[PDB]
Amino acid sequence: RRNGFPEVIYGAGKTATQIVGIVQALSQQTLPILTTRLSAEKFAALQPALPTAVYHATAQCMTVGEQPAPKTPGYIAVVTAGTADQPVAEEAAVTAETFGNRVERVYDVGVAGIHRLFAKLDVIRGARVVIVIAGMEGALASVVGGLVDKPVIAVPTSVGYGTSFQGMTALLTMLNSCASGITVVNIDNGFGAAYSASMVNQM
Amino acid sequence: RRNGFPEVIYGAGKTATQIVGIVQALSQTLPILTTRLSAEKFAALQPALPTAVYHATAQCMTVGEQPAPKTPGYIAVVTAGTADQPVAEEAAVTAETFGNRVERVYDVGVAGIHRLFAKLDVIRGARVVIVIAGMEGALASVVGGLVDKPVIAVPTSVGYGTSFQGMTALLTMLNSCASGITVVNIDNGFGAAYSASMVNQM
């Protein structure tokens, strides 16, 4: 199963020592190695062991090794509604770049001020895949889906106030988009979106 | 009493004979509005109330002559899709019956959003904006951020699957009230127009 994909470790349930055991075993230059959902403290416990490792604080991700160069010319656009979407957005962007994709970040363009979205519309329309990340309202996916004729993958986030229902509302909003060409992943699953986006980008 | 408001009958649960009794008793008020009045129920009603007008799409019935606008400004009724039109007309007929000029801005949902910008001057020129949308109710958020007038958003129960009979649109519109948006219950085109009329006539 040499799909060319880097090795991925889900560090939510793994200990800081348990992770080190996997990384040194996969340090046979198989590929670069991505570790997701890695707490900042858990990286502190790991850094003396892997001094050549890079931690992405906001994304809570850790990469060891450097992917050589983008595998494909096309890029993925990661679009977010607000600043509260920065963590899972960064998780999606770090995953896509680790998987060999160029990534264009289009942050803070929610529909409360829509000129910000129109200012960066040429960048979004030029992508081969667009990942839309939004919470509170999450209506941005429907607006983006109606403005681009490229695959859109929508990520609901759990940044909630009141009836946000820990991201449930954003999830339902994305599933019921009037605009077609939108497809959805589970709440906060920025990694998964980038995994699917990367497959689409590299055909 | 004598505070301008016409009498309103909710005909969803009331029988066609009961409606005649309420209307015949109240013909001693100027206009009378009846909401959620099925097309069959109006057929059973028309021989008895000959001065009545039925609004097919709105499922509303008026007896008496509709007044002329008491206020210069108008109310804009903005709708996302063609499905959303029944409840839109229910709001628009109520607003006109309460003495407000109504501007209809229909079928401008965000699946094609250039249509909304084409009619943006009309919406910004309103004193109150009623936004009517189903499925993902995202039209309310876009309008709320583009105008600086009170917006009342109406979620509709038109949609399929996880629309949850309008719940998704209702929750979507509720998650954007900091932008000047306020919300009414699902399909409640009457209630929105009732509030819009109070705001419009200040």
Place this chain on the structure above:
Amino acid sequence: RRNGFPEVIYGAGKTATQIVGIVQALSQQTLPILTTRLSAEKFAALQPALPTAVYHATAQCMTVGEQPAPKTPGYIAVVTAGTADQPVAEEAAVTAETFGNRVERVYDVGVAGIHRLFAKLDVIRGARVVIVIAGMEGALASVVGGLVDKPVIAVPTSVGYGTSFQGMTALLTMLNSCASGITVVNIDNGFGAAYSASMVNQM
């Protein structure tokens, strides 16, 4: 976009330093500046920098600058069912006064003792807009809506016991009011209600 509205900062996601940067940039006497959802500790970190700032503890709001005088004669009435509604009520009242409205506070008139509501009925009926704030039961909006012929904006609060469902029950109760002329915002969104109320009051 000179709507005359003061500048508003949502301090839930902003840091105490990040806020200071925005306030000093908007200290070009554009208008007074309101900051919402500002924790008491976060204000402590900010006060040495803005010594001319006023913190409203219960409202968790911060205003810098003083709006000159009410822009309109009419007033907004802020009506609450119980003492547990005081925080979001104060957030609504501080927002409306910062936006240039006179505000009349009618607190603790829930329907468990309804004479208290009738005692202050002349004050509520005299308003141009009424904001009703209630949790636990939230039936007060339907009672107020049936007693006034002016716009009512209902705010559900998340002060819950058991089946209160963190304010969901109060939200559903307000949406299904038998009394007409009621309009609703999301849970705890006292700011938003005052924003809509202010637009109605100043026509």
Place this chain on the structure above:
Amino acid sequence: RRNGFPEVIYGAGKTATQIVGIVQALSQTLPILTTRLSAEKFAALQPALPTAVYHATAQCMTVGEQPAPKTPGYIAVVTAGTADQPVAEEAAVTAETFGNRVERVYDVGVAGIHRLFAKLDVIRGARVVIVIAGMEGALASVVGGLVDKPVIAVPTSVGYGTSFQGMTALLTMLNSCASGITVVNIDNGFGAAYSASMVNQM
């Protein structure tokens, strides 16, 4: 046995023939009450049980003569709207069948609350109060705070949109039990009257 309580048949799921079998077998008890009995099912039943009375609005059927009140005091059945009347009559017919005087206080919902104060003396004079309401069920809270007698609140499934088939009214009434209010299931006019009768006849 011989504890005063009449026999009760739930006719919602039972067939019109099965009901005759249960009634004909039990005509060896004094009165017999049957609840949720459709109008069509009574037509199929009337030639067989000639001594039976159907209560159209209540969808109830009694065989045998209704007793006279065993207790001086009465039960008050308070309702918010005209829609709420079917389940109100279901409770009132049950309460009368169980030997209680019933006082009907109908159509006093809080959309016009002066109507409730007009009938306040009648409600306070009851020994038990049954409150019946739909939509926002807010009538139960107002009554619970105004009387110092047990209140049993019945949520009804009449309403539209987010009424959730009576859930909103049920939750609203449940959030006010500290005031002397107790709650039964949606549309359960029988159950409320069954409890009210036990309380009334102490």
Place this chain on the structure above:
Amino acid sequence: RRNGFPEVIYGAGKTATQIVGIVQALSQQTLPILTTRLSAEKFAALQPALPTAVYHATAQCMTVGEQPAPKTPGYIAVVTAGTADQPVAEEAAVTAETFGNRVERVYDVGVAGIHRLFAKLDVIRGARVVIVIAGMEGALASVVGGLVDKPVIAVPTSVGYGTSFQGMTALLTMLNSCASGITVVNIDNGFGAAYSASMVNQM
């Protein structure tokens, strides 16, 4: 409004000082005074001020004054399914005794072992009102309701595991009791049940 009921203070939202102010104001021998939902720490802050006060730890209630004697001969039976129901059961029992009722405690008779319920059936059937308190399953109300021909008031508790949904399941179970003569209050509202039970007991 001299209903003869003692004064009741809901101490969930009141401070330990705020409570002392109310108690000394109502210390005009109006009646005994009950305080509900009073944390153990909050009572520690209050006890130096009211040395003649009694705290009921499990019930989290505080009574000052002693009601003279039961107002009525009849008693209320407080029935619980398990030991986890002891707090709200005690809140109901302390409220009923403070309101002038004799109370018979029938604890730990859940239907997992039903002989325990049958052992105390004569006590339960002899009551004038029965309060049934149950969580996890809450099926005990339907069993009790089918065994007694006296008013049953059912209290759902929020002692939950998994699908218990913080007492929602027990609440729905009680509302749908096949046995008639059952009436329901909100989750954990042992006070409210005793308030309604006391009115029924004293007719």
Place this chain on the structure above:
Amino acid sequence: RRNGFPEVIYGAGKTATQIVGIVQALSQTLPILTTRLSAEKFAALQPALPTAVYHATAQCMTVGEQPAPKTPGYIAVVTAGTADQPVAEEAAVTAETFGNRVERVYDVGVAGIHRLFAKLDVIRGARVVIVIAGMEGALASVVGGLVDKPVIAVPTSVGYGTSFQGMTALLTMLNSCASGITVVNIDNGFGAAYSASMVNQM
């Protein structure tokens, strides 16, 4: 293959012609069971499959002769009310078709619980107990605590209001599995009997 289990057809979504095609193709297995088969669909089916038996209450259809019990012990099917009988018969017909002796213990819900104790020896003598209940599903908890044999509980969708189409009974039965109870989906009388048969024939 040849593991004793008869072939099973789910006829809820399958057409009356499609069923004949599946049955006619499989008549090359010993018995064939078809579940959720409407009464009208069997009328359209009977001229084509003349060796078939319809079980009206169970809405099941068997082709082929029902085997004799392969095991001495029996399965007990315990039901709370008369409404619960259709899904009870669906389970009982499946269990008999799979070669198990079935003992029916019907209408013993806890509204009158002496009835259950009258039949307690029969239930304790079973090797597996299937409990079928709606509304509050409390019968499963009482049985689970009284017998020391596997209990499989079936929630039914019969009930009104907050029954939530059987959700309340399902959750009630799920909150008592520590007592030896296990649960299947709402109305799934087949699934319970399928598991009971595997347990009974050990």
Place this chain on the structure above:
Amino acid sequence: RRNGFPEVIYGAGKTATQIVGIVQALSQTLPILTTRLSAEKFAALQPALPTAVYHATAQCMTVGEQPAPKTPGYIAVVTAGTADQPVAEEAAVTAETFGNRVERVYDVGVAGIHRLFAKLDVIRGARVVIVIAGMEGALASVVGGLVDKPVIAVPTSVGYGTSFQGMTALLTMLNSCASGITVVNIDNGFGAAYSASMVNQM
């Protein structure tokens, strides 16, 4: 405009006359697809649009000739059961109308999983895989882990009891997106094929 995509009409809420108006106006585009078109509505439509083809199972209607595949690769439409076939055909007809070769892999749900392995080479050879499943939607998880191509999963509303009109399948499929799976709304066979076509034609 001129971006390859055919015009799409949602005929669920639109009337049979309104559809003719939209189609007759747009016959000035190459193909036109109409979704959720009832069989009765097509009968009322056929005398007016004689060049139209109805796809009974898919409830779709095409006017104009279906193009030939613009791309070598094909899309695989994988389904769990025979019930799932209508929405599967809705996706497959859309995909073929958008110019993609479609490979149908039907009735391979995990109740018998050898069937899926029999057709595993066909699925792995696709460029995009659409998985269609109801009840427990577990087929999407198995496929997502076996192929290294984009998988779009469609939950269907076919099922009984706690299926919750497809919610259980939707949530099940959403809990496995880390494996290369992406999800659309319940019954939304069109939406999946719309996205699959964009991915397939890169």
Place this chain on the structure above:
Amino acid sequence: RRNGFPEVIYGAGKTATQIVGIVQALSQQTLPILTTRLSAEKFAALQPALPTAVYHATAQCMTVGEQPAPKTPGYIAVVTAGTADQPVAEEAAVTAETFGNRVERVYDVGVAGIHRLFAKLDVIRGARVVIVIAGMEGALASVVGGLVDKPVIAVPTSVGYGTSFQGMTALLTMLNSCASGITVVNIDNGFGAAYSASMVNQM
């Protein structure tokens, strides 16, 4: 009621002293004694008193005494989807072994990599009862149910991310299994599954 079952103590609500009182009372060699849902700290408070007791950290269970030998030849298979299922899996396995069953552990065979499940299929098919334990997706029960013709008892776990809804999704997935012969218990109830499995295994 000499069913031969060991005595079981639910230590979630019992104190460390309260447990010691029950164990010494049941130390009349009635059988071995199992204690479930026992926190690691609560065992520390208990160990000086029962020095012959065995704590199962992952299972959070405590057994005192040693069951003599398996009561039946047949074994129960405990199958899990991921490592996050290890706690309730161990609770089920420790309960079944304490009740006198041989237990075969088949861990980490979720359908994200299904060859792992096929590698151990002979072990699973050889069982007399299979307990399937899964969260996140919980689709493994339907796959196992369709592969074995023996009783399957499915346990949903509350190891959740986003829309996992604290195990609700896994519970609904298991109840709606297309594969027949599956039966379900409440969330995290590994004990209950083993209790039912043990009865089936020992016929």
